[PDB]
Tab-separated table of C-alpha atoms (C1' of nucleotides) in Angstrom:
chain	number	residue	atom	x	y	z
U	1	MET	CA	14.520	32.275	-0.233
U	2	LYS	CA	15.583	33.674	3.147
U	3	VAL	CA	14.040	32.426	6.405
U	4	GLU	CA	12.303	35.620	7.602
U	5	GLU	CA	10.574	35.960	4.213
U	6	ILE	CA	9.213	32.405	4.430
U	7	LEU	CA	7.967	32.773	8.007
U	8	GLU	CA	6.059	35.923	7.046
U	9	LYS	CA	4.096	34.148	4.317
U	10	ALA	CA	3.686	30.999	6.430
U	11	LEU	CA	1.733	32.912	9.069
U	12	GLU	CA	-1.087	33.008	6.535
U	13	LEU	CA	-1.283	29.249	6.904
U	14	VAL	CA	-1.331	29.017	10.698
U	15	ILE	CA	-3.065	32.185	11.894
U	16	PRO	CA	-6.894	32.113	12.090
U	17	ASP	CA	-8.552	34.931	10.114
U	18	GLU	CA	-11.009	37.578	11.341
U	19	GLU	CA	-13.922	35.267	10.470
U	20	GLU	CA	-12.800	32.128	12.294
U	21	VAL	CA	-11.731	34.349	15.185
U	22	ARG	CA	-15.017	36.246	15.391
U	23	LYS	CA	-16.934	33.000	14.990
U	24	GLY	CA	-14.960	31.726	17.954
U	25	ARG	CA	-15.487	34.927	19.915
U	26	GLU	CA	-19.269	35.004	19.680
U	27	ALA	CA	-19.292	31.281	20.488
U	28	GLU	CA	-17.044	31.923	23.472
U	29	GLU	CA	-19.339	34.721	24.649
U	30	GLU	CA	-22.624	32.774	24.424
U	31	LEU	CA	-20.982	29.881	26.260
U	32	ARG	CA	-20.153	32.099	29.238
U	33	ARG	CA	-23.712	33.411	29.431
U	34	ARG	CA	-25.380	29.994	29.505
U	35	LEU	CA	-22.819	28.929	32.087
U	36	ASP	CA	-23.551	31.951	34.276
U	37	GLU	CA	-27.339	31.778	33.874
U	38	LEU	CA	-26.742	28.525	35.769
U	39	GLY	CA	-24.098	30.116	37.984
U	40	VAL	CA	-21.442	27.476	37.339
U	41	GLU	CA	-17.805	27.762	38.401
U	42	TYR	CA	-15.890	27.465	35.096
U	43	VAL	CA	-12.518	28.284	33.559
U	44	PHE	CA	-11.790	28.466	29.824
U	45	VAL	CA	-8.409	26.875	29.222
U	46	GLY	CA	-6.376	25.284	26.471
U	47	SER	CA	-5.313	26.619	23.118
U	48	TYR	CA	-8.432	28.751	22.711
U	49	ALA	CA	-8.146	30.703	25.937
U	50	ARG	CA	-4.485	31.565	25.299
U	51	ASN	CA	-5.032	32.342	21.603
U	52	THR	CA	-2.651	29.717	20.259
U	53	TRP	CA	-4.832	27.418	18.161
U	54	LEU	CA	-3.630	26.308	14.768
U	55	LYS	CA	-5.741	27.853	12.003
U	56	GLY	CA	-8.861	25.835	11.282
U	57	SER	CA	-8.677	23.922	14.571
U	58	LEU	CA	-11.017	26.062	16.665
U	59	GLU	CA	-12.299	24.402	19.818
U	60	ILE	CA	-13.278	25.855	23.175
U	61	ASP	CA	-12.160	23.858	26.210
U	62	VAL	CA	-14.006	24.522	29.447
U	63	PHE	CA	-13.022	22.952	32.745
U	64	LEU	CA	-15.564	22.856	35.572
U	65	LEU	CA	-14.254	23.421	39.089
U	66	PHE	CA	-15.760	21.234	41.839
U	67	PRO	CA	-14.690	21.145	45.512
U	68	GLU	CA	-11.941	18.685	46.397
U	69	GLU	CA	-14.331	16.752	48.679
U	70	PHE	CA	-16.845	15.994	45.906
U	71	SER	CA	-16.900	12.358	44.815
U	72	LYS	CA	-15.675	11.048	41.477
U	73	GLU	CA	-19.176	10.125	40.378
U	74	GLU	CA	-20.615	13.434	41.633
U	75	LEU	CA	-18.307	15.247	39.207
U	76	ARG	CA	-19.505	12.966	36.382
U	77	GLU	CA	-23.264	13.229	37.094
U	78	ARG	CA	-23.230	17.005	37.582
U	79	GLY	CA	-20.637	17.509	34.860
U	80	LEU	CA	-22.886	15.686	32.398
U	81	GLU	CA	-25.964	17.668	33.478
U	82	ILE	CA	-24.320	21.045	32.921
U	83	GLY	CA	-22.750	19.984	29.649
U	84	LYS	CA	-26.130	18.682	28.526
U	85	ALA	CA	-27.914	21.922	29.450
U	86	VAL	CA	-25.307	24.272	27.925
U	87	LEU	CA	-24.592	22.659	24.551
U	88	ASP	CA	-26.766	22.975	21.453
U	89	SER	CA	-26.055	19.275	20.798
U	90	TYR	CA	-23.952	17.073	23.077
U	91	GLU	CA	-22.214	13.685	22.761
U	92	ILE	CA	-20.477	12.001	25.739
U	93	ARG	CA	-16.814	11.017	25.293
U	94	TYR	CA	-14.031	9.297	27.232
U	95	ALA	CA	-10.423	9.639	28.394
U	96	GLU	CA	-9.619	8.335	31.898
U	97	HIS	CA	-12.933	9.882	32.992
U	98	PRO	CA	-16.109	10.706	31.038
U	99	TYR	CA	-16.613	14.236	29.739
U	100	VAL	CA	-19.099	16.106	27.544
U	101	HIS	CA	-18.386	17.424	24.066
U	102	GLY	CA	-20.528	19.291	21.535
U	103	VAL	CA	-21.228	22.503	19.618
U	104	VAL	CA	-22.291	26.073	20.454
U	105	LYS	CA	-23.223	28.743	17.916
U	106	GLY	CA	-21.290	26.540	15.486
U	107	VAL	CA	-17.994	25.677	17.231
U	108	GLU	CA	-16.312	22.686	18.900
U	109	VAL	CA	-16.685	22.590	22.668
U	110	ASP	CA	-15.325	20.339	25.395
U	111	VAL	CA	-16.841	20.489	28.880
U	112	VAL	CA	-14.623	18.647	31.350
U	113	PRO	CA	-15.022	18.177	35.094
U	114	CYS	CA	-12.016	18.646	37.404
U	115	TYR	CA	-11.202	19.469	41.029
U	116	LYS	CA	-10.640	23.124	41.922
U	117	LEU	CA	-7.297	22.744	43.688
U	118	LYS	CA	-4.441	24.554	45.410
U	119	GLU	CA	-1.065	22.795	45.285
U	120	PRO	CA	-0.284	20.718	42.142
U	121	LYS	CA	0.564	17.788	44.419
U	122	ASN	CA	-3.042	17.091	45.478
U	123	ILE	CA	-3.814	16.204	41.844
U	124	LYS	CA	-5.805	13.019	41.257
U	125	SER	CA	-6.070	13.010	37.440
U	126	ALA	CA	-4.895	14.415	34.102
U	127	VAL	CA	-7.710	16.955	33.973
U	128	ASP	CA	-6.706	18.337	37.390
U	129	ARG	CA	-3.344	19.725	36.297
U	130	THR	CA	-4.764	21.184	33.108
U	131	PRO	CA	-5.888	24.295	35.048
U	132	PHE	CA	-2.367	24.608	36.514
U	133	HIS	CA	-0.578	24.331	33.181
U	134	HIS	CA	-2.924	27.000	31.878
U	135	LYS	CA	-2.022	29.120	34.865
U	136	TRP	CA	1.723	28.825	34.461
U	137	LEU	CA	1.338	29.474	30.744
U	138	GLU	CA	-0.990	32.437	30.306
U	139	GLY	CA	1.403	34.972	31.755
U	140	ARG	CA	4.433	33.634	29.928
U	141	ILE	CA	3.063	33.030	26.445
U	142	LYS	CA	1.434	36.391	25.777
U	143	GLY	CA	2.778	38.156	22.700
U	144	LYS	CA	4.204	34.947	21.233
U	145	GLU	CA	0.971	33.238	20.217
U	146	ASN	CA	1.998	33.515	16.569
U	147	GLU	CA	5.280	31.709	17.243
U	148	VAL	CA	3.295	28.870	18.851
U	149	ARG	CA	1.268	28.411	15.658
U	150	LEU	CA	4.227	28.419	13.320
U	151	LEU	CA	5.649	25.573	15.371
U	152	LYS	CA	2.284	23.774	15.411
U	153	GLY	CA	1.747	24.476	11.731
U	154	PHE	CA	5.240	23.083	11.120
U	155	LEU	CA	4.771	19.869	13.104
U	156	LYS	CA	1.298	19.066	11.744
U	157	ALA	CA	2.386	19.456	8.115
U	158	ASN	CA	5.073	16.868	8.717
U	159	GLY	CA	2.600	14.558	10.430
U	160	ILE	CA	3.942	14.613	13.966
U	161	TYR	CA	1.907	17.242	15.757
U	162	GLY	CA	-0.463	15.489	18.170
U	163	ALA	CA	0.656	13.483	21.225
U	164	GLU	CA	-1.923	10.677	20.923
U	165	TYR	CA	-0.677	7.148	20.262
U	166	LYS	CA	-1.613	7.316	16.591
U	167	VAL	CA	1.090	9.992	16.119
U	168	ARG	CA	3.495	9.912	19.067
U	169	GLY	CA	4.403	13.546	18.385
U	170	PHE	CA	4.367	16.868	20.274
U	171	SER	CA	1.372	17.908	22.392
U	172	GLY	CA	0.191	21.516	22.205
U	173	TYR	CA	1.346	22.093	25.765
U	174	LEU	CA	4.782	20.913	24.739
U	175	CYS	CA	4.792	23.409	21.869
U	176	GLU	CA	4.065	26.301	24.159
U	177	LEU	CA	6.634	25.219	26.716
U	178	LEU	CA	9.142	25.155	23.855
U	179	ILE	CA	8.268	28.709	22.841
U	180	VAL	CA	8.464	30.056	26.381
U	181	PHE	CA	11.918	28.431	26.623
U	182	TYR	CA	13.356	29.479	23.249
U	183	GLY	CA	11.431	32.666	22.545
U	184	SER	CA	10.265	31.967	19.000
U	185	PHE	CA	9.803	29.391	16.251
U	186	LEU	CA	13.109	30.125	14.567
U	187	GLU	CA	15.073	29.830	17.813
U	188	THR	CA	13.244	26.585	18.559
U	189	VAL	CA	14.111	25.180	15.133
U	190	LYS	CA	17.704	26.433	15.381
U	191	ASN	CA	18.396	24.846	18.759
U	192	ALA	CA	16.478	21.648	18.008
U	193	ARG	CA	19.249	20.907	15.508
U	194	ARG	CA	21.561	20.106	18.410
U	195	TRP	CA	19.002	17.978	20.285
U	196	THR	CA	19.953	14.358	21.119
U	197	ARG	CA	18.052	11.348	22.487
U	198	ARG	CA	19.588	12.179	25.885
U	199	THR	CA	18.594	15.855	25.953
U	200	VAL	CA	16.720	17.291	28.937
U	201	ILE	CA	14.957	20.626	28.602
U	202	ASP	CA	13.970	22.147	31.936
U	203	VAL	CA	12.097	25.452	31.578
U	204	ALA	CA	11.483	25.974	35.275
U	205	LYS	CA	15.240	26.128	35.838
U	206	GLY	CA	15.665	27.547	32.342
U	207	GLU	CA	18.268	24.899	31.658
U	208	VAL	CA	19.329	22.338	29.062
U	209	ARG	CA	21.303	19.359	30.339
U	210	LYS	CA	22.315	15.818	29.381
U	211	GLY	CA	20.062	13.148	30.820
U	212	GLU	CA	18.856	9.582	30.566
U	213	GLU	CA	16.388	10.323	27.732
U	214	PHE	CA	14.564	13.162	25.952
U	215	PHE	CA	12.921	14.920	28.864
U	216	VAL	CA	11.041	18.210	28.855
U	217	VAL	CA	10.215	18.618	32.552
U	218	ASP	CA	6.820	20.061	33.381
U	219	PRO	CA	7.034	23.568	34.969
U	220	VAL	CA	4.248	22.379	37.275
U	221	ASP	CA	5.771	18.977	38.161
U	222	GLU	CA	9.494	18.204	37.886
U	223	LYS	CA	8.504	14.517	37.701
U	224	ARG	CA	6.209	14.576	34.654
U	225	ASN	CA	7.892	14.532	31.255
U	226	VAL	CA	5.910	16.584	28.732
U	227	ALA	CA	7.419	14.795	25.712
U	228	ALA	CA	7.025	11.409	27.408
U	229	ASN	CA	4.948	9.981	24.586
U	230	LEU	CA	7.137	11.480	21.865
U	231	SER	CA	8.757	8.595	20.024
U	232	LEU	CA	12.462	8.338	19.369
U	233	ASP	CA	12.055	8.353	15.567
U	234	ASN	CA	9.673	11.323	15.586
U	235	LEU	CA	12.202	13.252	17.668
U	236	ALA	CA	14.826	12.147	15.127
U	237	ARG	CA	12.592	13.266	12.241
U	238	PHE	CA	12.146	16.662	13.885
U	239	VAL	CA	15.832	17.261	14.430
U	240	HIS	CA	16.371	16.319	10.814
U	241	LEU	CA	13.569	18.603	9.635
U	242	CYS	CA	15.058	21.619	11.393
U	243	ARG	CA	18.519	21.039	9.971
U	244	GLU	CA	16.871	20.947	6.541
U	245	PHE	CA	14.612	23.930	7.151
U	246	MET	CA	17.511	26.152	8.217
U	247	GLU	CA	19.592	24.895	5.314
U	248	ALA	CA	16.952	25.281	2.614
U	249	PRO	CA	14.045	27.340	4.022
U	250	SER	CA	10.814	26.634	2.164
U	251	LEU	CA	7.184	27.556	2.667
U	252	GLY	CA	6.697	23.925	1.666
U	253	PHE	CA	7.475	22.856	5.214
U	254	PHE	CA	4.135	24.180	6.472
U	255	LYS	CA	1.976	22.487	3.833
U	256	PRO	CA	0.605	18.923	4.091
U	257	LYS	CA	2.152	16.388	1.728
U	258	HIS	CA	0.267	15.322	-1.421
U	259	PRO	CA	-1.224	11.848	-0.733
U	260	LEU	CA	0.255	10.636	-4.055
U	261	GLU	CA	-2.131	7.825	-5.094
U	262	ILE	CA	0.470	5.850	-7.087
U	263	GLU	CA	-0.770	3.712	-9.982
U	264	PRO	CA	-1.060	0.058	-8.828
U	265	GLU	CA	0.793	-0.756	-12.051
U	266	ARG	CA	3.975	1.104	-11.120
U	267	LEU	CA	3.935	-0.657	-7.772
U	268	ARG	CA	3.909	-4.234	-9.030
U	269	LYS	CA	6.935	-3.263	-11.124
U	270	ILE	CA	8.822	-1.856	-8.145
U	271	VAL	CA	8.137	-4.991	-6.091
U	272	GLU	CA	9.431	-7.001	-9.004
U	273	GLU	CA	12.545	-4.855	-9.208
U	274	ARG	CA	13.079	-5.572	-5.492
U	275	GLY	CA	12.617	-9.314	-5.868
U	276	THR	CA	11.381	-9.363	-2.294
U	277	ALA	CA	8.298	-10.922	-0.736
U	278	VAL	CA	5.441	-8.507	0.045
U	279	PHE	CA	2.427	-9.541	2.089
U	280	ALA	CA	-0.222	-8.501	4.585
U	281	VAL	CA	-2.158	-10.039	7.405
U	282	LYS	CA	-5.753	-8.810	7.236
U	283	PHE	CA	-8.408	-9.008	9.907
U	284	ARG	CA	-11.442	-7.158	11.217
U	285	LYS	CA	-10.775	-3.964	13.088
U	286	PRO	CA	-11.623	-4.404	16.778
U	287	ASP	CA	-14.295	-1.881	17.758
U	288	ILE	CA	-12.054	0.177	20.065
U	289	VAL	CA	-10.528	3.639	20.446
U	290	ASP	CA	-7.494	4.663	18.376
U	291	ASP	CA	-5.562	5.065	21.614
U	292	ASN	CA	-5.974	1.368	22.139
U	293	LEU	CA	-5.888	0.107	18.539
U	294	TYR	CA	-2.596	1.646	17.443
U	295	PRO	CA	-0.404	0.488	20.300
U	296	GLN	CA	-1.794	-2.970	19.537
U	297	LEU	CA	-1.143	-2.806	15.800
U	298	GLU	CA	2.420	-1.817	16.715
U	299	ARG	CA	2.731	-4.795	19.027
U	300	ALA	CA	1.272	-7.208	16.499
U	301	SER	CA	3.233	-5.779	13.598
U	302	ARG	CA	6.279	-6.120	15.857
U	303	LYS	CA	5.758	-9.660	17.140
U	304	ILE	CA	5.307	-10.977	13.613
U	305	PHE	CA	8.395	-9.076	12.428
U	306	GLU	CA	10.555	-10.803	15.020
U	307	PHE	CA	9.035	-14.181	14.282
U	308	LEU	CA	10.182	-13.525	10.733
U	309	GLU	CA	13.740	-12.498	11.610
U	310	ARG	CA	14.477	-15.422	13.905
U	311	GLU	CA	12.770	-17.694	11.437
U	312	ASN	CA	15.302	-16.434	8.836
U	313	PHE	CA	13.155	-14.663	6.282
U	314	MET	CA	15.240	-11.493	6.641
U	315	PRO	CA	12.345	-8.993	7.206
U	316	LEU	CA	13.081	-5.552	5.781
U	317	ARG	CA	10.370	-3.517	7.449
U	318	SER	CA	6.890	-3.671	8.895
U	319	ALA	CA	3.956	-1.280	8.638
U	320	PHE	CA	0.260	-1.223	9.427
U	321	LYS	CA	-3.002	0.252	8.282
U	322	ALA	CA	-6.349	0.557	9.960
U	323	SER	CA	-9.392	1.526	7.905
U	324	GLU	CA	-13.039	1.565	9.050
U	325	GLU	CA	-13.728	-2.117	8.371
U	326	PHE	CA	-10.348	-3.888	8.315
U	327	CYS	CA	-6.772	-3.676	9.593
U	328	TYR	CA	-3.625	-4.648	7.703
U	329	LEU	CA	-0.201	-5.637	8.971
U	330	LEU	CA	2.265	-5.079	6.125
U	331	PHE	CA	5.629	-6.811	5.654
U	332	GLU	CA	8.464	-7.089	3.129
U	333	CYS	CA	10.959	-9.965	3.214
U	334	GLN	CA	14.264	-10.547	1.419
U	335	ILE	CA	13.404	-14.242	1.335
U	336	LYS	CA	10.549	-15.448	-0.883
U	337	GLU	CA	11.599	-19.041	-0.263
U	338	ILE	CA	14.086	-20.863	1.935
U	339	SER	CA	15.217	-24.491	1.868
U	340	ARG	CA	13.520	-27.080	4.022
U	341	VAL	CA	16.819	-28.267	5.626
U	342	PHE	CA	18.674	-26.061	8.112
U	343	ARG	CA	21.481	-26.796	10.595
U	344	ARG	CA	21.117	-26.876	14.372
U	345	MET	CA	24.038	-26.578	16.745
U	346	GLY	CA	24.738	-29.576	18.959
U	347	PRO	CA	27.084	-30.222	21.972
U	348	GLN	CA	30.892	-30.186	21.785
U	349	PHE	CA	32.447	-33.582	20.961
U	350	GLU	CA	33.913	-33.660	24.469
U	351	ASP	CA	30.930	-34.667	26.645
U	352	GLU	CA	29.551	-37.990	25.538
U	353	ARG	CA	26.507	-37.466	27.757
U	354	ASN	CA	24.966	-34.575	25.822
U	355	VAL	CA	26.264	-35.914	22.523
U	356	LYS	CA	24.453	-39.203	23.223
U	357	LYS	CA	21.123	-37.459	23.769
U	358	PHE	CA	21.682	-35.243	20.696
U	359	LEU	CA	22.613	-38.228	18.521
U	360	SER	CA	19.617	-40.190	19.822
U	361	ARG	CA	16.949	-38.268	17.973
U	362	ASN	CA	15.049	-39.669	15.017
U	363	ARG	CA	16.550	-37.658	12.128
U	364	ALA	CA	16.192	-37.808	8.320
U	365	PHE	CA	19.884	-37.130	7.683
U	366	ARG	CA	23.055	-38.064	9.582
U	367	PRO	CA	24.509	-35.361	11.854
U	368	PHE	CA	28.164	-34.390	11.507
U	369	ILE	CA	31.145	-32.912	13.332
U	370	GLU	CA	32.452	-29.464	12.387
U	371	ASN	CA	35.093	-27.446	14.194
U	372	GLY	CA	34.805	-29.567	17.312
U	373	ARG	CA	31.068	-29.698	17.951
U	374	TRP	CA	28.214	-31.724	16.565
U	375	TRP	CA	25.530	-30.355	14.284
U	376	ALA	CA	22.494	-31.917	12.690
U	377	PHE	CA	20.495	-31.236	9.540
U	378	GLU	CA	16.771	-30.751	10.026
U	379	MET	CA	13.509	-30.004	8.290
U	380	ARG	CA	11.408	-26.843	8.617
U	381	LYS	CA	7.630	-26.941	9.012
U	382	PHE	CA	7.309	-24.090	6.480
U	383	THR	CA	9.460	-22.543	3.722
U	384	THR	CA	7.928	-19.177	2.769
U	385	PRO	CA	7.294	-16.057	4.872
U	386	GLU	CA	3.529	-16.249	4.319
U	387	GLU	CA	3.480	-19.896	5.361
U	388	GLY	CA	5.253	-18.922	8.589
U	389	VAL	CA	2.963	-16.057	9.486
U	390	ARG	CA	-0.047	-18.312	8.783
U	391	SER	CA	1.229	-20.799	11.316
U	392	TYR	CA	2.406	-18.132	13.797
U	393	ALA	CA	-0.698	-15.918	13.673
U	394	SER	CA	-3.031	-18.958	13.976
U	395	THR	CA	-1.135	-20.404	16.875
U	396	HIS	CA	-0.167	-17.162	18.663
U	397	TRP	CA	-3.221	-14.985	17.977
U	398	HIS	CA	-2.984	-14.133	21.675
U	399	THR	CA	0.288	-12.255	22.407
U	400	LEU	CA	-0.696	-9.872	19.561
U	401	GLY	CA	-2.788	-7.415	21.488
U	402	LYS	CA	-5.779	-8.153	23.700
U	403	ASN	CA	-8.328	-7.046	21.124
U	404	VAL	CA	-6.219	-7.200	17.983
U	405	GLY	CA	-5.204	-10.712	18.920
U	406	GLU	CA	-8.767	-11.766	19.712
U	407	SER	CA	-9.842	-10.547	16.285
U	408	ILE	CA	-7.127	-12.549	14.531
U	409	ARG	CA	-8.212	-15.722	16.365
U	410	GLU	CA	-11.672	-15.569	14.830
U	411	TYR	CA	-10.568	-14.429	11.404
U	412	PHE	CA	-7.500	-13.445	9.434
U	413	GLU	CA	-5.915	-14.082	6.046
U	414	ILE	CA	-2.704	-13.470	4.150
U	415	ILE	CA	-2.851	-11.348	1.014
U	416	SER	CA	0.023	-11.290	-1.461
U	417	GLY	CA	0.831	-10.233	-5.001
U	418	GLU	CA	-1.707	-8.650	-7.355
U	419	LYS	CA	-4.486	-9.251	-4.832
U	420	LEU	CA	-2.671	-6.974	-2.346
U	421	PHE	CA	-2.077	-3.903	-4.547
U	422	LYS	CA	-5.858	-3.850	-4.904
U	423	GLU	CA	-6.206	-3.453	-1.137
U	424	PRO	CA	-6.172	0.054	0.459
U	425	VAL	CA	-2.586	-0.308	1.633
U	426	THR	CA	-0.566	1.151	-1.249
U	427	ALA	CA	0.402	4.483	0.286
U	428	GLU	CA	1.730	2.653	3.320
U	429	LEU	CA	3.524	0.131	1.082
U	430	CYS	CA	5.226	2.899	-0.875
U	431	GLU	CA	6.150	4.729	2.326
U	432	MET	CA	7.593	1.499	3.665
U	433	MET	CA	9.747	0.671	0.647
U	434	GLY	CA	10.856	4.255	0.319
U	435	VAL	CA	9.443	4.533	-3.184
U	436	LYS	CA	10.257	8.054	-4.311
U	437	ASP	CA	8.026	10.328	-6.393
N	1	G	C1'	-9.404	-1.109	28.741
N	2	G	C1'	-5.229	-0.936	26.274
N	3	C	C1'	0.341	-0.305	25.463
N	4	C	C1'	5.333	0.214	27.412
N	5	C	C1'	8.783	-0.710	31.673
N	6	G	C1'	10.610	-2.896	36.206
N	7	G	C1'	9.766	-7.390	39.915
N	8	G	C1'	7.841	-11.994	41.889
N	9	G	C1'	4.461	-18.132	41.661
N	10	C	C1'	3.998	-22.628	35.839
N	11	G	C1'	4.100	-25.334	30.288
N	12	G	C1'	5.994	-26.339	24.924
N	13	U	C1'	10.822	-26.261	22.254
N	14	U	C1'	16.046	-27.645	22.922
N	15	C	C1'	21.830	-32.069	24.016
N	16	G	C1'	21.168	-28.186	27.230
N	17	A	C1'	16.986	-22.447	29.530
N	18	U	C1'	16.262	-17.996	34.471
N	19	U	C1'	18.222	-17.229	29.677
N	20	C	C1'	14.362	-19.225	23.151
N	21	C	C1'	8.687	-19.299	22.098
N	22	G	C1'	4.325	-18.601	24.983
N	23	C	C1'	0.060	-18.989	29.137
N	24	C	C1'	-2.004	-17.599	34.810
N	25	C	C1'	-0.009	-11.891	40.014
N	26	U	C1'	2.913	-7.321	42.206
N	27	G	C1'	4.840	-1.729	41.504
N	28	G	C1'	5.970	2.396	37.844
N	29	G	C1'	4.866	5.276	33.262
N	30	C	C1'	2.091	6.742	28.918
N	31	C	C1'	-2.891	8.419	25.601
N	32	A	C1'	-4.181	11.586	30.701
RNA sequence: GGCCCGGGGCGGUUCGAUUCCGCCCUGGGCCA
């Protein structure tokens, strides 16, 4: 239908209802009491304070303000104590510095220590500028909360909301800065259509200019880039999503995509139709945080891809899947098998010196002259993609992530054919080959 | 801790490497 009509109905998918709101209100209230019965200096921030939390994602963030002089450990010890005392049930967590997380009257709570500061430049850690962002934002985002959610509801449905390494999308702060700059969801979507990989959005100066890379400069620090961890392809996917949304508005842009558990029978057929080589490197998932695992899987998946291209197996694409127990590096190659002999380029006929050394090597077949320079035939140590990765992974387990690599050294295997479609990697495999349905 | 980027002290591969494939420091950024 028409845009406006779609946005109206979409709100019902991103705006929290009376219940969830009340539930959050009474939780918010109780939390302040307990905190004051202890007389603690606190400041509710984040999406909850400013009423811009995507429906069904309720979570109260509470930053504790300690004097600048207090030590790092002092903030941790005392921070922990207060979080322990105030939460129904706690559960320490980490991100640059420890912090306490738990539940109160039934809702998600984060209790984070940080230095009460004046002047964004004295900042010593992520958590320190959070209060500032909140500051800059509360006055400027009032009355637009609902536009913030449409944008969040939009991004999450198309799997690119969060800014953690597992997604490389848009952080919530980024979403609000984009609303403050454009005024509403529609205007944000309309202008995003003209975004490029060299676009710089500066809200403090209220200006859009051409720069070295996608840069949304932080109102609080002209040096920080709010979309810094937003990947090039996810930016590209967003620009393309807006062009489509404006062209064919659909409430279907705010709804998650159906997993589509394709029949393992239809898949084998498709792979046959492609005539390609499809395989996976499996290994035990290192026991580490997703912020560390994913960048590694990307590195590993990447290193092996390049080993394949220079090795001549014409790799189409790579992919990767991490479950609870194992991790899979997926690959598809245009070359199931390649000949054992290949040609290597020798020196020009001109200099007898280099030619002499090149013609002095023990070779199965006689080298020849072509277009002025010498070349030699030679044998490969492997002729299929899987053979190559088996050699490569076994001999280069390092260089594939500190942890990921260390896991491959102790154990790994190559799965192919029927045996692979039985593994939990089908959705990724379909996504990778661009199977449509 | 990890990943990315930008600099400095070594092997294997190759007729031939700073330049390919990798292993041991210094400054930036990112999840923060």
